[PDB]
Amino acid sequence: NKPQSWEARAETYSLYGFTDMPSLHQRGTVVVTHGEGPYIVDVNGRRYLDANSGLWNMVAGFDHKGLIDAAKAQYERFPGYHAFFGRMSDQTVMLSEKLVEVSPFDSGRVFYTNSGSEANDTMVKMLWFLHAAEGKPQKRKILTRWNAYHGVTAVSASMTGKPYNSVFGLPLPGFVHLTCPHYWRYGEEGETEEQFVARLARELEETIQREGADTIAGFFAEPVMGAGGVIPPAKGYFQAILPILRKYDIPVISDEVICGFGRTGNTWGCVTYDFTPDAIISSKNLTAGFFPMGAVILGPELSKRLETAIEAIEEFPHGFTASGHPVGCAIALKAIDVVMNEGLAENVRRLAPRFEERLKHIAERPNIGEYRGIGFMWALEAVKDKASKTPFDGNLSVSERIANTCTDLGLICRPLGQSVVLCPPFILTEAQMDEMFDKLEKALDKVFAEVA
Amino acid sequence: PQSWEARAETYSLYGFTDMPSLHQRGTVVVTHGEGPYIVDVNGRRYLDANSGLWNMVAGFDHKGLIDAAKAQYERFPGYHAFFGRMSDQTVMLSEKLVEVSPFDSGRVFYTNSGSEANDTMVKMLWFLHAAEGKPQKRKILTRWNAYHGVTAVSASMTGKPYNSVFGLPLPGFVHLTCPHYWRYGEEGETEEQFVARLARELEETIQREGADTIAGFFAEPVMGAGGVIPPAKGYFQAILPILRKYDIPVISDEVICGFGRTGNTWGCVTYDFTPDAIISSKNLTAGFFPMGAVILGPELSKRLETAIEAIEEFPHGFTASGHPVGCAIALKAIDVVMNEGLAENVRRLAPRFEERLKHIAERPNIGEYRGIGFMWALEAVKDKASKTPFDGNLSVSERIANTCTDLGLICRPLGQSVVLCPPFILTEAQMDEMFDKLEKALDKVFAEVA
Numbered sequence: 001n002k003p004q005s006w007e008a009r010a011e012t013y014s015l016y017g018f019t020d021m022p023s024l025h026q027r028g029t030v031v032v033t034h035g036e037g038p039y040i041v042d043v044n045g046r047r048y049l050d051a052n053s054g055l056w057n058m059v060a061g062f063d064h065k066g067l068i069d070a071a072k073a074q075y076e077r078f079p080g081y082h083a084f085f086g087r088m089s090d091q092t093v094m095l096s097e098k099l100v101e102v103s104p105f106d107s108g109r110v111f112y113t114n115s116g117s118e119a120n121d122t123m124v125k126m127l128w129f130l131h132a133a134e135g136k137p138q139k140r141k142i143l144t145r146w147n148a149y150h151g152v153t154a155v156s157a158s159m160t161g162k163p164y165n166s167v168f169g170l171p172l173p174g175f176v177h178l179t180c181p182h183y184w185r186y187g188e189e190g191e192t193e194e195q196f197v198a199r200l201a202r203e204l205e206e207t208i209q210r211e212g213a214d215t216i217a218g219f220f221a222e223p224v225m226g227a228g229g230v231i232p233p234a235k236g237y238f239q240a241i242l243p244i245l246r247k248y249d250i251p252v253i254s255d256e257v258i259c260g261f262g263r264t265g266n267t268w269g270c271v272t273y274d275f276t277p278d279a280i281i282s283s284k285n286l287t288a289g290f291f292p293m294g295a296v297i298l299g300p301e302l303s304k305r306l307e308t309a310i311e312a313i314e315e316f317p318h319g320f321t322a323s324g325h326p327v328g329c330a331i332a333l334k335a336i337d338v339v340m341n342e343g344l345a346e347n348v349r350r351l352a353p354r355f356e357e358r359l360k361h362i363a364e365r366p367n368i369g370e371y372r373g374i375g376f377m378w379a380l381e382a383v384k385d386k387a388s389k390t391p392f393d394g395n396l397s398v399s400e401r402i403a404n405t406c407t408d409l410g411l412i413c414r415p416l417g418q419s420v421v422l423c424p425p426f427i428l429t430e431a432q433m434d435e436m437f438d439k440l441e442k443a444l445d446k447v448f449a450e451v452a
Numbered sequence: 453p454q455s456w457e458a459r460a461e462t463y464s465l466y467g468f469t470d471m472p473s474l475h476q477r478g479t480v481v482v483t484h485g486e487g488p489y490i491v492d493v494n495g496r497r498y499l500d501a502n503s504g505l506w507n508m509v510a511g512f513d514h515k516g517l518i519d520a521a522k523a524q525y526e527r528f529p530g531y532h533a534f535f536g537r538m539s540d541q542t543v544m545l546s547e548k549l550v551e552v553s554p555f556d557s558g559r560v561f562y563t564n565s566g567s568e569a570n571d572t573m574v575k576m577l578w579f580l581h582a583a584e585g586k587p588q589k590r591k592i593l594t595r596w597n598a599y600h601g602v603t604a605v606s607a608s609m610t611g612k613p614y615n616s617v618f619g620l621p622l623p624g625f626v627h628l629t630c631p632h633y634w635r636y637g638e639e640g641e642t643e644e645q646f647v648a649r650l651a652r653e654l655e656e657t658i659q660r661e662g663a664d665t666i667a668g669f670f671a672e673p674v675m676g677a678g679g680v681i682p683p684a685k686g687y688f689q690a691i692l693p694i695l696r697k698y699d700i701p702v703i704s705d706e707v708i709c710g711f712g713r714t715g716n717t718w719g720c721v722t723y724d725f726t727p728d729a730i731i732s733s734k735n736l737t738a739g740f741f742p743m744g745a746v747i748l749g750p751e752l753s754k755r756l757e758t759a760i761e762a763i764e765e766f767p768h769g770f771t772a773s774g775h776p777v778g779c780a781i782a783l784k785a786i787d788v789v790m791n792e793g794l795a796e797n798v799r800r801l802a803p804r805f806e807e808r809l810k811h812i813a814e815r816p817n818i819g820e821y822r823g824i825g826f827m828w829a830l831e832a833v834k835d836k837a838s839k840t841p842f843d844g845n846l847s848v849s850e851r852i853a854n855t856c857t858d859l860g861l862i863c864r865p866l867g868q869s870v871v872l873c874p875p876f877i878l879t880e881a882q883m884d885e886m887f888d889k890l891e892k893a894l895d896k897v898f899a900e901v902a
């Protein structure tokens with residue numbers, strides 16, 4: 001009784017992650033064979049415009065010749081190794097030199113992982129290691145914000161501020177979730193944006209005082225929240241919170257997994273939001289989705305502190321088998337070159353005004369509560385009533401319905417809560433952006449005429 | 453910085469690297485390899501008797517594997533496996549993994565690493581027991597000297613003293629006695645009594661903790677980073693009925709043992725035990741791509757599917773999970789290991805490997821040799837009769853390994869031991885080269901230390 005179709009084979013042997021099971025049973029797995037520019041093609045030859053770059057990461061599209069050629073060239077040269085025991089590939093040394101150079105840091109050090117989850121988990125371990133070595137083993141608590149997404153390891157899931165993590169009995173103790181700086185959602189009745197930011201700063205200060213600064217290991221933040229539904233922080237947020245963190249000796253980590261390498265219109269989300277973190281977490285665009293790589297980029301202050309702590313014990317007992325893989329490092333060197341030097345990062349800056357202008361027009365509809373975003377990261381929030389910010393009942397699945405209608409029109413859209421997220425590849429043309437918008441509008445025109 | 457060595461030190465934060473040796477010797481920057489050899493920036497060639505990190509079983513320039521990697525980049529260079537979408541390569545590999553696993557049926561979940569795969573398996577157990585009305589069933593049983601990875605959870609599962617630097621283990625991670633008879637057997641305790649004690653100890657721990665509070669048990673069939681530790685005779689035959697008696701899922705961590713190293717496709721087959729799930733990585737891609745897999749047997753597959761259908765979505769996964777390049781590479785690595793004579797070369801050469809180690813173990817400073825297939829270790833001692841090791845300050849194993857490097861051999865120092873886990877492509881002449889160089893390093897270091 002062996003399965004025959006691609007659909008039956010997928011269901012017989014897979015355990016699906018982040019997959020809505022009722023939709024999967026109704027529709028069948030969409031099995032993908034190849035891509036062309038920003039388009040993905042399934043086993044039935046159907047072509048979809050992937051307006052999510054796969055998972056934010058495939059910024060150069062699905063068949064970029066330069067990246068394909070750089071990947072092939074490294075397999076022909078040296079197809080694998082590790083970075084332990086005082087050995088490392090030439091590609092690993094070149095990537096660390098490049099990452100420190102492209103980072104906003106004047107100097108620093110890089111530690112490799114395969115994923116963003118491992119890199120966040122690693123940063124947490126580095127902070128525990130460092131503070132205990134400096135005479136404060138109780139300095140262990142990690143501050144993140146509700147709606148944040150930092151990954152799925154037990155630690156990186158505890159840092160994530162998502163209700164679904166209750167199914168794992170998470171967060172673990174020592175993981176503190178601050179108010180999310182989403183003004184439209186979290187601003188109170190009659191609270192101005194300036195008051196809202198001031199309240200976030202008083203809340204952080206009160207939290208640090210109650211918990212005790214000596215028990216707090218670090219603060220992580222995505223400059224613009226990704227999986228939280230594309231959330232640029234309220235005006236002046238980083239300028240209000242960062243002095244408080246610095247006052248209390250709380251290391252500041254920018255989680256640049258999504259924001260690194262151009263999506264917010266700058267190389268780093270921390271540059272767009274004008275703040276200097278002590279370390280950066282990078283992945284995704286780092287390899288343009290061509291290879292699993294994550295990196296922890298430590299600034300000068302933490303680099304110096306960690307090295308003294310490591311010199312004292314003689315060895316830093318942490319690392320992944322594939323950390324610093326020569327193939328991933330060669331691919332990352334090419335992805336960085338493609339994004340920064342081949343006009344991809346510029347294309348986001350050039351097309352962001354037109355992107356915003358079309359979303360502003362779409363937001364005039366009564367069922368759109370707001371549009372939000374920056375550069376090539378945007379969201380449209382669905383509402384039953386605009387003035388009162390009333391959502392549609394959770395059972396109506398408005399965003400999933402918009403997204404399913406988009407799939408049927410040949411557009412890949414991401415439903416998140418009551419929102420629809422767009423994060424297309426940086427290679428997107430004006431015509432393809434018009435294509436993306438026309439199909440989304442037809443899906444909005446259908447779902448809103450139906451539910452409301 | 454100008455030199456490769458200075459550039460490496462200026463920009464790297466080194467993991468699992470002895471900093472005094474690094475400052476003394478400089479970073480060894482590798483540019484390429486040939487068969488089982490690695491070549492540095494100075495053109496020096498070393499026989500890598502550790503397959504890089506156990507994983508590069510087909511060597512450093514395998515044409516079939518390089519061609520398979522290139523062909524997938526040309527076809528489809530990347531994608532994910534979320535939201536009901538997945539590459540054709542991901543479906544193919546799941547089908548193949550279930551087939552080659554000892555399970556008649558099952559399901560596969562992907563990760564990038566062995567650490568993520570273990571951390572994932574722990575979350576899966578927390579998820580499952582809570583869904584089945586036992587949210588307190590959270591504790592994880594591992595052994596002292598086990599190595600399961602470096603995420604906070606997989607480091608908590610690892611039984612290494614160095615984890616104290618991170619304030620780890622986290623609560624709820626219980627380390628049972630290591631079934632290494634030579635080290636943990638008491639004075640006057642037979643191997644049979646030793647195994648009976650570890651069974652009694654497991655039962656006592658389950659009874660003290662409460663079976664309803666224990667999520668699962670994980671075991672490497674042969675311990676790897678622990679220093680190549682085959683378990684004491686009849687260990688799994690004594691512990692498994694206890695775990696099954698108390699409803700404690702059994703997970704075989706096959707990250708090193710999967711695909712051939714013990715002389716079988718899985719370490720759990722070599723040790724004649726059926727786990728409920730398998731953790732696979734390393735040989736899975738022959739070190740050509742970061743991939744890990746959780747292979748769920750039929751019982752856990754059914755219970756997890758029921759729990760997932762009840763909440764409608766399993767909210768877990770990594771951006772690169774099921775990457776089509778990793779999947780096309782893993783399909784080729786499995787083909788090379790199982791069909792191109794590599795797994796067979798391990799069985800064919802394991803007797804010669806052991807015969808040579810038995811001769812080396814005659815030396816007064818070798819406490820024991822241990823291992824199986826293509827996984828072995830030699831334990832250095834000051835005194836054989838009393839099992840007295842050399843003082844930690846003498847760094848005997850590091851000295852053996854640094855001497856090996858100076859002779860063009862890469863071998864791994866672990867504790868007071870030296871580990872050999874060479875590629876499956878190793879010829880008899882290359883095995884002779886590995887042992888001749890090792891014996892010269894043993895002669896040099898032992899003559900200096902005593």
Ligand SMILES: Cc1ncc(COP(=O)(O)O)c(CN)c1O
Pocket residue numbers: 114115116117118120149150151152222226227255256257258283769770771772
């Ligand atoms: C901001 C952010 N941080 C961390 C991660 C975790 O990265 P990975 O899926 O590679 O583990 C993600 C993944 N969506 C992310 O968006």
Ligand SMILES: Cc1ncc(COP(=O)(O)O)c(CN)c1O
Pocket residue numbers: 319320321322564565566567568570599600601602672676677705706707708733
């Ligand atoms: C048995 C075992 N399990 C898990 C792991 C973790 O694998 P990774 O380094 O890919 O995280 C290792 C890695 N040495 C291992 O040997």
Ligand code: NA
Pocket residue numbers: 099100101102103104105106107
């Ligand atoms: Na810089």
Ligand code: NA
Pocket residue numbers: 550551552553554555556557
């Ligand atoms: Na099978």
